[PDB]
Design an enzyme around this catalytic site. Structure first.
Site, short mmCIF file in Angstrom:
data_model
loop_
_atom_site.label_atom_id
_atom_site.label_comp_id
_atom_site.label_asym_id
_atom_site.label_seq_id
_atom_site.Cartn_x
_atom_site.Cartn_y
_atom_site.Cartn_z
N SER A 149 -11.49 -1.66 -0.34
CA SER A 149 -10.26 -1.55 0.37
C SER A 149 -10.39 -2.09 1.73
O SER A 149 -9.49 -3.13 2.14
CB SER A 149 -9.69 -0.31 0.36
OG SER A 149 -8.96 0.05 -0.87
N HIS A 197 -4.11 5.69 3.70
CA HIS A 197 -4.59 4.32 3.19
C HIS A 197 -3.75 3.19 3.91
O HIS A 197 -4.64 2.27 4.22
CB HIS A 197 -4.24 4.33 1.81
CG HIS A 197 -5.10 3.44 1.04
ND1 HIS A 197 -4.89 2.00 0.65
CD2 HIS A 197 -6.79 3.56 0.79
CE1 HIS A 197 -5.86 1.54 0.32
NE2 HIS A 197 -6.83 2.30 0.34
N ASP A 232 0.86 -1.15 0.07
CA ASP A 232 0.14 0.00 0.18
C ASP A 232 0.93 1.18 -0.12
O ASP A 232 1.94 1.53 -0.52
CB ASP A 232 -0.80 -0.17 1.32
CG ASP A 232 -2.20 0.18 1.14
OD1 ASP A 232 -2.40 1.92 0.96
OD2 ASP A 232 -3.10 -0.38 1.26
#
Lengths: 321, 114, 106, 108, 97, 95
Positions: free
Chosen positions: A250, A67, A30
């Site tokens: 996600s 994220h 990520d």
């Protein structure tokens, strides 16, 4: 505790089946993880496949800064956010933004160089996103076929948001490694990718539906999505130690990765085929989600973890004969 | 004899990476291989009813298979030159497995230091 | 006798897909499966390793990992048994690194 | 002799954190450590507690595996070989129990 | 063939431990330690039966009717001795004789 | 009954285990301790398995088997003589 714990059945008894002794490390491929708050004890290793060389996230966009931390917190956070498998450690492989050429490939190639000896260290690779605009696909397919032949690791891949029917999408608009479409009987059975779609909030026993919306809406399509997991009204950790709430594939991918990590603890020597077949066979099958998900599969963590930990009870817990 | 005797060697913070089981001269045995990293590897065998370490075969088999499964770092206690059949020593090892311990770090493990 | 004797054969990178257990002439046995091999308790020369191999074979059946199967053909002689199952005795088991490279003698 | 004799000591609400197995004078043994910290050892065919070696090994390994809080029953001064006592302990493991709280456990 | 082992019972009769399994039409079969010609396989069968009960996979149950004769035992359980077990590929195709 | 507690120890050179399930019931099996000692290993295995899953089971017991007063006081006089899987809270497999 979060709503999705009851919906997928992450009960006290199910979680009590997992082995504490097994080193379990999830690969979070990520935007970099901030090992703060509930993730402060979760670090195993950190990597950079970005031009800046930093394994830590950057403030290019708030979405990209948060994220990696968000995803790792859903998997293994020990306090604040409730991680699916808090005993797991996290290996952060920062591929974005300002990634090197084929940053996603280089990170998977580094995982596959097997530097870490323990079977449960980076056996589960979480890719809560990936690459669009893939024209060659030669690189991805040659790497993913080798991984399936080696049969030891699993890639948990988000199918992407935009609410699009993956079957009607152009090859260029499809997210990799999820877009991997194995051709032969051999490559279909060996397939190391678990393609995850997002579900809207529900209660266990209630018929779930895919999460909709133009922005956070789950992509879908039979033979392009393997399983559907919770991906709406999901609380995650931010690098500033505050929490955020989000929806999308996600989140759903991070929850599947955590379930698989919990399973892995019971026998990390089990092949990728053994764990993938248990996760998917233990999945609830709904008639209403057949067009959207292959066989209309919905993550049953109680059935997946208990099935897997019971199968290994005698060989692993009670060898003595 | 004792696992913690000075003669016997140790390897700390090892992951058991390989397992083999067979039989020789009516005695079952098993072999293990453990690695600290790239550098370095250790092999050790336990044989049933093959003195002096024959009595611990069952316990060591169960424990070694468990640690092979978890992949947790462990200390391997061994005794060099125990096995003597040359083709066996060539293919596998002369080392007897004489003990196992859990580790806290790559160097700090539970049990005697010898 | 030894698992690593030249007489005995091997099959590397094998996934144990089938398992059978029974009894013949007051001796329990098990059969694994392509290559098949059986181990019988107290049935020489390989009878001493029955319990270790049972345990190990069931463990590898459970993980599904590729392994090396060491066998000795022509050990079981009862014709209906050989017809239904195999004459091969199971004489050893190993973990594998590749489909051809496994731990132990070769 | 009994696990519940007054002579034997206890440590309640303990998570078995360490495990060691070896052999001494033709007898296999195993040692556990739980966390204050306590160490206990069980030896096969080594009286008075030798008969419970297999049951305790299986039970101790199971609770190590689950990491649940347990009660460890021990008898000090059983193992007398000085290098063994120095490196490990003198305490014999004589029993094990599941716990409800850090102080309330099942058994004597 | 193609039976899921859904029930398990263990006890003792006349100083011999035994176990009983039920699988699903339904079939019951009991193995007793040191009893009958099939006594030698008790430990192997117990281990393999408990394994299959744990996985829940479809298996083949090999049995011999009329082996257990004590009428209250036969009434409560079965006369069937458990004499072997196999993994199955389909509901009719299993490994073994 | 859900098996909620597990105890193992030794008395007079015999290993034994105790279980408690939930009204609550306690029962102990002792190796080589007649009449039910032949069943110690099968019952240990089964009880530990059922303790792990937490599934409801039937406990078969015999009162007044254990007679050492401190043992009976701390634990029970009940001998564990059998175990069964259950379909409902009342319907279980076996006699």
């Amino acid at each position: 505790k979060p709503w999705y714990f009851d919906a997928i059945g992450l009960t006290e008894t199910t979680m009590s089946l997992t082995d504490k002794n097994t080193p379990v490390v999830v690969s979070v491929v990520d935007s970099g993880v901030a090992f703060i708050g509930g993730l402060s004890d979760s670090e195993f290793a950190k990597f950079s496949f970005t031009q800046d060389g930093s394994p830590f996230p950057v403030k290019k966009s708030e979405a990209l800064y948060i994220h990696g931390t968000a995803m790792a917190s859903l998997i293994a956070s020990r306090y604040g956010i409730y991680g699916v498998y808090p005993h797991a450690l996290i290996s952060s492989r920062r591929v974005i933004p300002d990634g090197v050429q084929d940053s996603w490939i280089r990170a998977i190639e580094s995982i596959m160089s097997n530097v870490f000896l323990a079977p449960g260290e980076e056996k589960i690779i979480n890719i809560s996103g990936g690459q669009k605009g893939v024209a060659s696909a030669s690189v991805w397919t040659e790497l993913l076929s080798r991984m399936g032949r080696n049969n030891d690791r699993l890639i948990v891949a988000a199918v992407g948001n935009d609410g699009a029917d993956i079957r009607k999408l152009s090859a260029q608009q499809r997210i990799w490694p999820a877009a991997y479409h194995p051709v032969s009987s051999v490559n279909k059975k060996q397939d190391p990718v678990i393609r995850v779609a997002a579900l809207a909030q529900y209660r266990k026993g209630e018929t779930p539906v895919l999460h909709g919306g133009g922005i956070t809406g789950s992509r879908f399509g039979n033979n392009w999505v393997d399983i559907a997991a919770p991906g709406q009204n999901i609380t995650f950790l931010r690098p500033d130690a505050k929490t955020g709430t989000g929806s999308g594939t996600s989140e759903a991918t991070a929850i599947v990765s955590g379930v698989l990590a919990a399973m892995t603890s019971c026998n990390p020597r089990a092949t990728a085929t053994e764990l993938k077949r248990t996760l998917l066979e233990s999945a609830d099958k709904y008639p209403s989600l057949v067009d959207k998900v292959t066989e209309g599969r919905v993550l049953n963590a109680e059935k997946a973890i208990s099935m897997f930990c019971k199968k290994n009870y005698i060989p692993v817990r009670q060898g003595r004969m | 004899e004792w696992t913690g005797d000075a003669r016997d060697g140790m390897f700390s913070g090892v992951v058991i990476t390989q397992f083999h089981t067979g039989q020789i001269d009516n005695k079952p045995y098993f072999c293990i291989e453990g690695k600290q990293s790239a550098g370095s590897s250790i092999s050790a065998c336990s044989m049933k009813n093959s003195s002096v370490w024959g009595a611990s075969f069952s316990t060591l088999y169960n424990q070694a298979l468990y640690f092979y499964t978890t992949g947790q770092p462990v200390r391997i206690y061994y005794e060099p030159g125990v096995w003597t059949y040359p083709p066996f020593v060539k293919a596998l090892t002369s080392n007897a497995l004489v003990g196992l311990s859990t580790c806290t770090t790559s160097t700090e493990c539970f049990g005697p230091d010898r």
